[PDB]
Design a binder for this molecule. Structure first.
Ligand SMILES: [Mg+2]
Ligand SMILES: [Mg+2]
Ligand SMILES: [Mg+2]
Ligand SMILES: [Mg+2]
Ligand SMILES: [Mg+2]
Ligand SMILES: [Mg+2]
Ligand SMILES: [Mg+2]
Ligand SMILES: [Mg+2]
Ligand SMILES: [Mg+2]
Ligand SMILES: [Mg+2]
Ligand SMILES: [Mg+2]
Ligand SMILES: [Mg+2]
Ligand SMILES: [Mg+2]
Ligand SMILES: [Mg+2]
Ligand SMILES: [Mg+2]
Ligand SMILES: [Mg+2]
Ligand SMILES: [Mg+2]
Ligand SMILES: [Mg+2]
Lengths: 207, 147, 203, 102
RNA sequence: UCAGUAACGGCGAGUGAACAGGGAAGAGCCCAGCGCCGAAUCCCCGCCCCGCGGCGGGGCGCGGGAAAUGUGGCGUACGGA
RNA sequence: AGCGGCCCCCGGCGCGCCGGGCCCGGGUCUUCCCGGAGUCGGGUUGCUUGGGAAUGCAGCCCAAAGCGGGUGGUAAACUCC
């Protein structure tokens, strides 16, 4: 029974809603549970990284977001065949591997291989038996200086190049931008008819 | 604040502020928006015109990302780059020009609204508009596209 | 060797050979009872592609199921209610006849745990099947390290809770745009996540 | 004049080079093998043909292909599966015509 | 969070999703088929020794049973031998 | 109240041996092999979902294929990715 001037609106409460009501009084006693099951997890593995193995650099889809770089699932198998690492050792040294990724470009393949070459030079590798190394193990020096790394390892940061102030050419004053955007729209709509009427003239000119 | 309401000031009056002839019963005029076309016709024909009917084309699996295009004017185009670059640009006698990026600052299309102060610029964007292109061509400076 | 093309024989179902072997086996099966044990599977091809290793422990039954829909068990007509809900004849059942056959042969022998089922023959009014049952506590199943997952008490009655491949179709799940309405656990909690009010503390 | 990578048009998009890597193995499912053709034609040599095609051969002996197309499209499915079935029975019709002509 | 939105509906009353983005948690795998190794396979009964309040290991059994209508090993779509 | 004391019990996990088990990995090149069948899909009737020339499920008849098959939100053919 609406009065003079109020907005129309449709509330979704014709159902029985009082039976299924999710309260949130748990919340300040579940942030403490997760804090304990995370710090007792951080003391089980004493020198390992707390934040999971390192994770690749990947762009994002959907033209709204295609100018960012964020974390991924795991490395591909081209970023490991080139970097010379076997695909089941990398699972055992803390390197995320997913076999479901393509590489259609090249300029992210290279920056991943370079990031692996950074981590391989930061990695302190303990000996199996603390009495006998391998060819590639580390010395008894770094063991005394081995410690954890809180936070996401080598955090992924969005960098931008810069440019200084150039001098404007005499040419760019004569570049009409809008009659080129609306030419490419017209040329992108008339690609079939232009290529069909020429065929119909090639069927008509035999006469 | 039970103590500031109205019903705490009505304990003593019989009807409690809803009359005696036609009492406050439960639902006189239907429940909700009943009678758009029969007997609440005047309220919708006087306050919500065009509540009734269909118009136009349907579009099924519609995303809100293919048509993402935030805008900007030429008034505050100088607000992206900090102050001391517009100064050094108005100060040097050489004839250089500071490059303004919009896509980096979260804008795509460049419209044109206001007056613009006279110093040469270079704009990298993804679209333009015809007034907003002839104001920069008229001041001096270019309009550069980018995919 | 043979198992590649017994496989390709058992898709000549219109041919004269399989139209003979079924125009015989369905008759032989029709004079038996509804649920009886055979000593060896009629199809070893299809039997091995589901997990039937030919050792001690695995059992194979054979049950018949009658055919058709399901008309509503009311008196004469008399389905009291609005005229939407009058329908008695042309109703159709949700789960298949294959997981009817599985749980008819899964309740009568309660000491066993169902693995999977397959097809054998068809009549006008009968559909026959085969089933595969596993002893949970026999020492050959027990000491295998791969497949001692059955004996765990979770997998009791896989067929009543709908976990066989014949009930996984009835549940309506997978991935994609085609399966929106089973996000979460199932179809129910895809309803429960939606039709509730999350009332925060501060709102 | 000058050219820019236009984000709308015919060849739109940011210009990034491209690599040629090995196509994924799963990209091949059962394309075919020589052992497979060896045995699928031996079983074809053992059992014959279905009784919806022992009428199609008999309507393709009178050089009707539109009628036997509406007759194998009514049964088997679409028009694509009807075509790859018909181009196959113009072959296992012509090998008898070839051997009887031999 | 998108969203009370694209859509349905005597298009009236009213019902009503997902993808992307930021976060909690983070773990992945095995068989059949194709093939090769002389059933290279299990379970139970027998005697002895050790331990046995979750019935197990090693030695012996011309002592018996199931499996060629297929038991084990390598091997599964990231290619493999 | 206190990293205060004492007396019992069961473990978690660290080290010595004494036992048995298992002899296995890379890289680079030549020759071989490689996949789930009354199901996919099509017509139809009925319930369903926001899904609209029919999203899913179920029933009846018809019933496949290997440079093949399904999907690419308006039915239909010819096409390319
Ligand atoms: Mg009133
Ligand atoms: Mg008064
Ligand atoms: Mg009043
Ligand atoms: Mg009164
Ligand atoms: Mg009155
Ligand atoms: Mg009232
Ligand atoms: Mg009704
Ligand atoms: Mg399932
Ligand atoms: Mg809103
Ligand atoms: Mg009306
Ligand atoms: Mg998402
Ligand atoms: Mg975490
Ligand atoms: Mg194995
Ligand atoms: Mg095998
Ligand atoms: Mg409905
Ligand atoms: Mg079904
Ligand atoms: Mg469409
Ligand atoms: Mg197309």
């Amino acid at each position: 029974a609406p009065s003079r001037n109020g907005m129309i609106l449709k509330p979704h409460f014709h159902k029985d809603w009082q039976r299924r009501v999710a309260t949130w009084f748990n919340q300040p006693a579940r942030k403490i549970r997760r804090r304990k099951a995370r710090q007792a997890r951080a003391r089980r593995i004493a020198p390992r990284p707390a934040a999971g193995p390192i994770r690749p650099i990947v762009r994002c889809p959907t033209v709204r977001y295609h100018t960012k770089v964020r974390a991924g699932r795991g490395f591909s198998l081209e970023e490991l065949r080139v970097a010379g690492i076997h695909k089941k050792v990398a699972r055992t040294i803390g390197i995320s591997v997913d076999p479901r990724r393509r590489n259609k470009s090249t300029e992210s393949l290279q920056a991943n291989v370079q990031r692996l070459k950074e981590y391989r030079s930061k990695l302190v590798l303990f000996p199996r038996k603390p009495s006998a190394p391998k060819k590639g193990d580390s010395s008894a020096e770094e063991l005394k200086l081995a410690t954890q790394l809180t936070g996401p390892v080598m955090p992924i940061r969005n960098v931008f190049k810069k440019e200084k102030a150039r001098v404007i050419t005499e040419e760019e004053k004569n570049f009409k931008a809008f009659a080129s955007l609306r030419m490419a729209r017209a040329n992108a709509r008339l690609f079939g008819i232009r290529a069909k009427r020429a065929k119909e003239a090639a069927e008509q000119d035999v006469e | 604040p039970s103590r500031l309401r109205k019903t705490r000031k009505l304990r003593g009056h019989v009807s409690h502020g809803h009359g005696r002839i036609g009492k406050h019963r439960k639902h006189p005029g239907g429940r909700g928006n009943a009678g758009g076309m029969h007997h609440h016709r005047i309220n919708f024909d006087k306050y919500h015109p065009g509540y009734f009917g269909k118009v136009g084309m349907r579009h099924y699996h519609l995303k809100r990302n293919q048509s993402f295009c935030p805008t900007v004017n030429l008034d505050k185009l100088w607000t992206l780059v900090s102050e001391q670059t517009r100064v050094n640009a108005a100060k040097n006698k050489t004839g250089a020009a500071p490059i303004i990026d919009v896509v980096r600052s979260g804008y795509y299309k460049v419209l044109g609204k206001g007056k613009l102060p006279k110093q040469p610029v270079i704009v990298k964007a993804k679209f333009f508009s015809r007034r907003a292109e002839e104001k920069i061509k008229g001041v001096g400076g270019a309009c550069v596209l980018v995919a | 060797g043979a198992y590649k093309y017994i496989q390709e024989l058992w898709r000549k179902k219109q041919s004269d050979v399989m139209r003979f072997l079924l125009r015989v086996r369905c008759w032989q099966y029709r004079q038996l009872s509804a649920l009886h044990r055979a000593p060896r599977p009629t199809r070893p091809d299809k039997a091995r592609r589901l997990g039937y290793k030919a050792k001690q422990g695995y059992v194979i039954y054979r049950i018949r199921v009658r055919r058709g829909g399901r008309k509503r068990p009311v008196p004469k007509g008399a389905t009291y209610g609005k005229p939407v809900h009058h329908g008695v004849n042309q109703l159709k059942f949700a789960r298949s006849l294959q997981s009817v056959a599985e749980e008819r042969a899964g309740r009568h022998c309660g000491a066993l745990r169902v693995l999977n089922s397959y097809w054998v023959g068809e009549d006008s009014t009968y559909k026959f099947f085969e089933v595969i049952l596993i002893d949970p506590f026999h020492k050959a199943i027990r000491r295998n390290p791969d497949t001692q997952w059955i004996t765990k008490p979770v997998h009791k009655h896989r067929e009543m809770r709908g976990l066989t491949s014949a009930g996984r179709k009835s549940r309506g799940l997978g991935k994609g745009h085609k399966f929106h309405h089973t996000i979460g656990g199932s179809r129910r909690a895809a309803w429960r996540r939606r039709n509730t009010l999350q009332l925060h503390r501060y709102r | 004049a000058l050219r820019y990578p236009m984000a709308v048009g015919l060849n739109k998009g940011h210009k990034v080079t491209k690599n040629v890597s090995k196509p994924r193995h799963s990209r091949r499912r059962g394309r075919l093998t020589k052992h497979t053709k060896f045995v699928r034609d031996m079983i074809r040599e053992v059992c014959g043909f279905a009784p919806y095609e022992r009428r199609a051969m008999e309507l393709l002996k009178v050089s009707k292909d539109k009628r036997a197309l509406k007759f194998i499209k009514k049964r088997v499915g679409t028009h694509i599966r009807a075509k790859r079935k018909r181009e196959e029975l113009s072959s296992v019709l012509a090998a008898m015509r070839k051997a009887a002509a031999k």
